[PDB]
């Protein structure tokens, strides 16, 4: 009754744009880790946008531009992060592939090589949903939509913190920030404060067909991505509420 899995052997990894923003100090160890993972998994690596998107939001909001104008502008920053990450992995056979290629030709591309990189933003563009002046469907959301549409073996989200806390661990309430080893999408959706993942992510988890859990792990700690791809618990597990057939 649930749709079939298009690429059940696929592993999807979303790298946060704010991880990319740290430059070589974060990116070189991540790249060395990805290199060693290449023989172990068939990877779609998707990059988020990070700080540049905040800058374009600052300019665009000042110009009065609607949320559909802002969505593709932020997406371009994720795409640029993807090109940067792919370039560092080029010597291992990895390249950036465009959204149409991801959507229609990922099978052949992962037959050619062990991993490809793409932008985690989904092409909502000018058809982004209205309501907030900030585009709701960002990189975590796009990555999950794909992973779930593919029926991938997993989606791992690589963050610049250990996982989800009860408050922003870098914010003004960071003293009350308690680490959450495990949570459900529904519990998260019913809390008010900030998250390290899009709120739209929790919405698409509610309608997910395949992916039972998503782990958010600290990409600043070498080994955590590798462990997460083996299903080891080293970050926050988010249960999507999908159940087995």
């Amino acid at each position: 009754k649930r749709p079939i899995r298009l690429l059940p052997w696929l592993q999807v990894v979303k790298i946060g744009g704010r991880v990319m923003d740290r430059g070589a100090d974060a990116i070189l160890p991540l790249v060395e880790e990805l290199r060693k993972l290449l023989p172990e998994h068939r990877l779609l690596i998707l990059t988020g946008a990070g700080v540049r998107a905040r800058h374009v939001f600052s300019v665009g909001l000042d110009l009065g531009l609607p949320v559909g104008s802002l969505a593709p502008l932020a997406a371009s920053e994720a795409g640029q992060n993807g090109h940067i990450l792919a370039a560092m992995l080029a010597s291992e056979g990895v390249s950036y592939v465009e959204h149409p290629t991801v959507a229609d030709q990922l099978a052949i591309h992962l037959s050619a090589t062990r991993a490809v990189v793409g932008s985690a933003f989904p092409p909502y563009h000018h058809h982004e949903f209205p309501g907030s002046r900030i585009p709701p469907h960002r990189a975590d959301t796009g990555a999950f939509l794909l992973a779930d549409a593919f029926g991938a073996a997993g989606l791992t989200i690589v963050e610049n913190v250990d996982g989800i806390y009860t408050a922003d661990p870098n914010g003004p309430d960071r003293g009350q920030a308690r680490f959450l080893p495990e949570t459900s999408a529904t519990d998260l959706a019913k809390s008010e404060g900030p998250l390290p993942v899009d709120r739209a992510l929790l919405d698409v988890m509610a309608t997910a067909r395949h992916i039972e859990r998503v782990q958010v792990v600290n990409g600043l700690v070498p080994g955590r991505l590798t462990a997460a791809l083996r299903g080891e618990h080293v970050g926050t597990l988010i249960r999507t509420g999908v159940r087995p057939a």
Binding site: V51, F57, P66, V67, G68, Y124, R133, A149
Partner: protein, 268 residues
């Protein structure tokens, strides 16, 4: 609220942070194409019917553009329903079905555009920013394919694999995104009824209704895609839509003149 506070929040907070979201809400509101009207021509309800439905609409479009700037998006119709049923039967997910449905709206845009070409009206991608045709009195209209771009990233419905955001949603979001003055859905019924008028014989016409009133009456999923009604409630620019019968001669023209033909559905 200042630009400084907003810019600090934007740099220092997650985009999910409610304080940042509130600050962003206070931003100025630019309307990109405030003088344009977006019109959707139904696929099943109009274009699939062929010449008897399409030719008079073409003539109305040609007459109407003399006085009204139009973006004319196409629906999909029975060929998309056929693709959906084949693909659903194979267990394909909503995201693969979304891609299949765009091809059909594209076909319909192409047929409509070929009828309009000698009148100077192009089929475009990027209707909202086809700045030239929309600025010329000799043109003053474009045709576009009405499916949203989401493709494989289409959010599925709660049940089943039919893409919930199709051409009604595609055309509406374009109107909303470009701050258009008006959104007209051109279908094959005079507007909204208390029940499906094709099925029920004693359905009563509804000239005007809000989205909440529609939901309270269980018309959530009737003449417009139910996701469209939720979009309409969150809209910044287009806070009401009009549904008219394109099979009635001059109905589109009269709706463009501010005549209250059909049904007006309001966000609130």
């Amino acid at each position: 609220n200042s630009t400084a506070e907003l810019e600090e929040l934007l740099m220092q907070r997650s985009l999910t942070d409610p304080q940042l979201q509130a600050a962003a809400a206070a931003a100025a509101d630019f309307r990109i194409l405030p003088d344009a009207t977006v019109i959707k021509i139904g696929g099943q309800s109009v274009i699939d019917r062929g010449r008897a439905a399409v030719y008079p609409l073409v003539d109305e479009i040609v007459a109407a553009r003399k006085n009204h700037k139009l973006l004319i998006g196409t629906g999909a119709g029975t060929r998309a329903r056929h693709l959906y049923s084949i693909a659903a039967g194979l267990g394909l997910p909503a995201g693969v079905l979304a891609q299949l449905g765009s091809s059909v709206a594209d076909q319909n845009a192409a047929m409509l555009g070929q009828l309009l070409a000698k009148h100077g009206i192009p089929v475009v991608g990027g209707a909202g920013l086809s700045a030239v045709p929309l600025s010329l009195a000799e043109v003053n209209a474009v045709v576009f394919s009405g499916m949203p771009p989401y493709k494989l990233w289409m959010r599925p419905a709660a049940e089943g694999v039919i893409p919930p955001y199709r051409t009604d949603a595609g055309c509406f979001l374009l109107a909303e995104q470009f701050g258009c003055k008006q959104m007209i859905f051109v279908k094959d019924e005079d507007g909204l009824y208390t029940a499906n008028p094709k099925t029920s014989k004693d359905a009563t016409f509804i000239p005007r209704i809000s989205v909440d009133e529609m939901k309270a009456k269980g018309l959530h999923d009737s003449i417009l895609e139910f996701p469209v009604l939720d979009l309409l409630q969150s809209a910044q620019h287009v806070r009401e839509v009009q549904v008219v019968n394109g099979l009635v001669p001059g109905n589109l023209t009269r709706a463009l003149a501010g005549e209250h033909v059909g049904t007006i559905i309001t966000a609130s």
